[PDB]
Structures are given as structure tokens and as C-alpha cells.
Amino acid sequence: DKISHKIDIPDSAWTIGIGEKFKNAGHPNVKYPMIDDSYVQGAPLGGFGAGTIGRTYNGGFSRWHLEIGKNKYTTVYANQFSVFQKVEGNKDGVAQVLYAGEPENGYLSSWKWDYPKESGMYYALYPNSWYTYTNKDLPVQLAVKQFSPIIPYNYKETSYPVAVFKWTAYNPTNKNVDVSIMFTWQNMIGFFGKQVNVNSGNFNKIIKDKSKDSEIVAAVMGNISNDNEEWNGEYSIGVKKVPGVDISYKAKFVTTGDGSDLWHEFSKNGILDNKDDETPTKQDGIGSAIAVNFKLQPGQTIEVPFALSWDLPIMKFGGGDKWYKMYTKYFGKNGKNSFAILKEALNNYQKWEKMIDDWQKPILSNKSKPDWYKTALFNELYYLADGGTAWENGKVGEKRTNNMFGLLECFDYNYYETLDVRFYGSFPLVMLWPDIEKQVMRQFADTINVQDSSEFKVGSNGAMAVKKVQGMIPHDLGSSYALPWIKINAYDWQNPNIWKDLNSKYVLLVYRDYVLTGKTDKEFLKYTWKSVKTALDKLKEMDKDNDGIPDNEGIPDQTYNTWSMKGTSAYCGSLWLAALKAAQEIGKVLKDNEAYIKYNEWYKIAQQNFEKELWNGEYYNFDTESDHKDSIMADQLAGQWYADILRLGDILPKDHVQKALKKIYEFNVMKFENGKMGAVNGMRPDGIVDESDIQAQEVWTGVTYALASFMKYRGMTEEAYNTAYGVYKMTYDKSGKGYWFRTPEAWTKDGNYRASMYMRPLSIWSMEV
Ligand SMILES: O=[N+]([O-])c1ccc(O[C@@H]2O[C@H](CO)[C@@H](O)[C@H](O)[C@H]2F)c([N+](=O)[O-])c1
Ligand SMILES: O=[N+]([O-])c1ccc(O[C@@H]2O[C@H](CO)[C@@H](O)[C@H](O)[C@H]2F)c([N+](=O)[O-])c1
Ligand SMILES: [Ca+2]
Hints:
The protein is of the alpha+beta class. It has 16 helices and 31 strands. It has two domains: about 375 residues, no CATH class; about 400 residues, no CATH class. About 25% of the residues lie in helices and about 20% in strands. It starts with 13 loop residues before the first strand and ends in a 15-residue tail after the last strand. The structure holds 2,4-dinitrophenyl 2-deoxy-2-fluoro-beta-D-glucopyranoside (NFG) (2 copies) and calcium ion (CA). It comes from Thermoanaerobacterium xylanolyticum (strain ATCC 49914 / DSM 7097 / LX-11).
């Protein structure tokens, strides 16, 4: 490896060998069908709300999130980079697709597949990833840096459906070598959203944009239809000329054939035919190719940028609604703008690289933090783009000031903005994209007094319930299978209108968003204040026994949706206490004296009773009425965790909080698989895991990262990082279970998982507060 020195990969990048087999991989541990796309994954490309594309460490474009809200894992084999090399003096060169695999059927059989093992590495530090190619049959060593411009405090480039591929080529040998790099791409119009004739009308055109000191050559892969539908739009690939390189292209090769129309050209001398052909296809799949060819002298380096864009302006959800995607604000809505997007990327990628470096640098440069922590911190952010992210710029045929936003819980449970989970998962948004965060919270505020008396069948018990009760915060803002932002509470397995954590978490999120954006946004507090008061007042009505605390009902009525709490729980009770303290503080800011007094009174009573009912001398009991009420819950003091972040002070005594956290580390971490796998949710006082429900026996990745942040704030530095390390290890390390770029909600002691690609572990960003 002589190419790594010519590029700048951070030491904290996650690494794996190209073509590496992973032996230890985990699988779903539930009885029902669950997504398992394997460990062959990578950092995604694509902006927020753009649709994303997962290019794996093997080189394939395989995890397709272009249909917003859907996860489709299939390798589109025509989508590749390939290389040709010929040493000056040899009669023949060699050509190789840079993919560690081959197609399953006979399409593209002419291409040179099966990039060999032990011949290159993949690196990732989201939003960047890299591949290096160090192959005994490729005298010129190559690397590529690939990324999309995901930039904190930037709502423009961050939305773009674009990727850059910045290639570096170096000749360490003593002979001249002719080199070509070729990008192939299938015209994927009709890959989704088209019910018949999936390739019909697809056609490819070549754009040559020549001006002074700029030449861009691109293929635009579109359809003859000017219809405005979810399926229609354009893909583009292309390259920017640099000194010493020539560009060639092929506008149309058949992807549903043996590929030799293209490959006979590329494998000869790495130069394509420059054949334009705008003939639309009927049944055949078609694709385009863009190549560069150059001669490298001994010791010479060259850099050349390629790019990929996709202009698919309309997202459709299963309930029938069609919306424009965010990026259309910047490029238009007609679906004929892929070249414009590509050109912007090819002309500005160096600036974008520096913007990414500028935001990553303060963390990367902090030599007090271990590299493993940085690996997880940055790479967990993959989910902000890969979580079915929806970000609208108008309903098709409808303009508003704001752009509604939603992130999925996960794909197995297809619910946008599950608030009980976003309590943990939304940290990166408040810290790095606060205008999105505040928009989402205003969406929730607007739902508070919505009443929908239509009934639904509650899946767990068969009872009928009102869809949405006035004064109750919704569990979620809909499903991609139905009507995001329009039909809320798509979750129907239980009734969200009786949950005991939604209303408190809502208030805590509101106050969090004020505090972590500088305690200056009074307008945000004003917008949300009525909903905050309503939320707390409604929750107070669920106190059955007049102890001042809402009662859990002995069935699941909070985020641990199969683990029943009864009476006063540490979890919901502590959240309630913190939410009351937050509302007091908002009351002071807004000069609402009567609210301040009321919530102060409720707080003092509830605090006294919480302590009496639950403090046992060592920790806070799980609850007051369950069979295993004395279990040690990892998340028992979630309200105090948020109170620390919100600078609300001690809601419980410092000594008792310290004792409880030490107990949790000693038991839930250190007595669970030697503290190498995170914090198990429930442990009995005898040091055996609580077996009352599956969720008690699970480590929740997002709960564990949040607990690590709580320990860190309380000065338990070693315990904090040791706790978080188990989650990092399981996700990323060779000794783990292979969950990189698909961090699950949970695993059990065997390492097997539930719900890959999960919102909650974004909570690792609470460790940066
Ligand atoms: O000059 N050539 O080497 C060559 C070879 C195959 C060619 O055509 C190829 O034929 C294969 C066998 O029917 C099909 O599977 C491919 O789809 C087609 F590209 C072409 N061509 O039509 O461009 C040229
Ligand atoms: O998920 N959301 O973004 C969202 C927002 C407002 C929503 O609700 C809307 O709220 C407005 C302001 O409170 C009211 O004027 C409308 O009557 C109501 F439809 C809903 N919803 O009714 O399901 C959902
Ligand atoms: Ca009570």
C-alpha cells in the first residue's frame, strides 16, 4: 500500500478489507419476519430527503432507499467503477470491475468480475468513505474518496441527491502505465414506482459542457415521458476534465445482455467509442459509461473527480400523497435537472470537502478522545440520511414557509417520528441541524389538540380506541405506507393516547431545543407553550391514587412497549419530574406566573413521593406495583439525564443519582457478558438478568449511549466510555456482530438483534453536549 500516503484518511475511519468475509454476523432474534440484509453494507450517499444509495464495502450499489421510506437491498450490477491498466511495452493491458463479486445470472458476463481478496480496503467516516486498490496485477495504485455534502447548519447542499467520487492514481513503478477509470450506470428510471413496462421510453444522452478551464462530460439517463410522477426523473453520471486526462464515453449499452458492447472497447485500450445514441428502449435495460484515460509516469500522481446525481423530484407514500423533495427548492421540480446537480458537484466538490473537514476537525483534533469513539460518533450519523428521511417542498398540485421533515423509527416498524424514540435519537438534529429539529417539534405542537374520534382496533388486546385524543401527543406522524404528516398515530399495536412518556418527553424535547440552541429562541417557546401546558395537564389526569405522579397501568404504556410498568415507575416518574421542572422554567421565561406556581406545586409533591416510593438505599426501584418491582433498570433515571442536559439541576439527590449510576454500571453493564456489550435493560438484585420480558433481557443501543452520556456528565468518565465501548464493539469491531451502517435497536446476550437500521442509537451525540 503506497496510495494511502497520497490521500488523507482519518485514523478513526472504520475499516474492512474489500471482499472480506465476516464470520461472526448476527441475525434477527424475533419469531416474526425481520429485515436482515447481511453485513455487506457501507456508508450511504445522498442528502437528507433525497433518497439514498448504499454502496457497500465490496463496491456494489446495493442498499436502495430511493423510494422514500423503503429499504430495497439488491445489487444493480451495471453500476460500477472499472479500471484498465497497460504497462508501456506490453502487448495487452488488464481490465477489472472494482466489485468483489459477480452477477447471479448471465447479464454482463463479459465483464471481469470478482475483484480479488487482500487487494484493497474500504474506509468510512461518515459522510466520507474511501476505497483503496492495492493489487499485484494493477501496477498503478488507486484510491477514491466518495461523499455527499452533509454539512451541519447547512440546509441546502445537505439536501442534494448527489455524490462525488474523487479518484487519486499513483505510479510507484519504474515504467509508464496507461490507466483508465470507467463509471458505468444503469438507466434506473422504472426501478421503482412504475407498475408496467419498466424500461419503456428510457433513453440516454451525452452532455458536453465546455467553457474556459472547464470541461464536463456527462450522461443523462431519463425517459421520453414529461409526466410528473414518483417514477420519472433522471440519473446522471459524469466527469470533469483535468490536465493530462482524456475523456471517452458510451451513451448506450445494454444492461440486460452480456455487456460486451461496452466491455470489448474498455478491455482493449481503456477507451470507449464516443457513440451517442438517443434511441429510447422498449424492453431492454440500458446504461451509460463515462471513462478517463491517462498515462502515469514513474512517481506521478493524478486526481480526477466523477459524480453521480439523481433528479427524482416526487415522493409518493402508500396512502396516495405525492410531495416534492427538498432539493427541488434549489434545482426545480420538473425532473429534468440531473445535469445541473451534477455540474454543481463537479465544480464545487473541493469546497464541500473543506466544509466537511471544518465540521469534523474539532472532534478529530481532540486527542483526549479515543479513535473508537470518533468512529461511532460520525458513522452513527449515517441514519439521518438512511432512515427513510422525508423532507418536503410542497404537495404535488397544491406554497408554505416551512418544509416538513420526518425520520423513520426503522424499516421493520415503518413509523415517522416516533417521539418516544426521538427523545433519544434526535440529538444530532438539535446539535447540528437545529432548524430541522425545531420544525419537527412545531409539527408535534400542532397536533396537540387534534381530535380524531374515528376508531381503530388495538392490535395487542383487540379493543377499539379513538385514533387521536385532544391533549395527548401522538406516538408518531404516520407511516410511509400511509400518509406522513397527515394521518398521525399509524402505530396501532397499542393505544398511544394512554402512553405515559409521550407527553413528558414532548415537553423535555421542547425545553432541550431551547437550551441547546443558546436559550435565545423565545419565539419557539411561545409557539409551543400552549401545547406544553396542555400536555402536562392531561398527563396529570392519569394519576389514579393522588400521589401527584401519573400511574403506569400494568400493561405496556411507554417506549418499552412489551415491558409493563405499574403504579409509579422510575422511568415515567423521573421523566414527569423533569418535565414539570422544565415547564416551570419556561413559565419563568414567558412570565406565566400561574403556570410557574402550578407546576412548581406539582413538582414538589411528585418529587417527595417519587423518592419515598422508589428510593431503596442503593438505586430507584423499577416501579411500585410490578412482580419484579425491585429490578435495576438501566434507564431508571432518564428524567435526571435530561435534567442535566437542560441545566435544570438536581431533580433527585446527587448522592442517590451517583449510587444508582454506579449500581447500573456494576450490574446492568459489568454482570452482563463482562461489560462488553452495553447495558442490559433489567437486572435482578441478585445479579441475574430480569426474565419477566424480552425487553428486560435486551441491550438497547440508544439507551446505552444515552446512559453513557449521563455517566459522563456525572464525572463517571471511565464507566461512561466503557459502557459505550460495548455498543461500538458489537456494531463495528471484528469481534462484534457486523451491524455497521445498520445499528439495531437491540441485541440479546447471544449478540443477535432486533430491528436493524434504528433511530435510537443517534443518541451517541448526547455524549458531545
Ligand atoms: O464488436 N464486438 O466485439 C461486439 C460484440 C458484441 C456486441 O453485441 C452484444 O451481443 C451480445 C450477444 O448477443 C449481447 O448479449 C449484448 O447485449 C450485445 F452487447 C457488439 N455490439 O452489437 O455492439 C459488438
Ligand atoms: O404530522 N404533522 O406534521 C401534522 C401537523 C399538523 C396536523 O394537524 C393540523 O394542525 C393544524 C394546527 O394545529 C390545524 O389547524 C389543522 O386542523 C390540523 F389538521 C397534523 N394532523 O392533523 O395529523 C399533523
Ligand atoms: Ca399516581
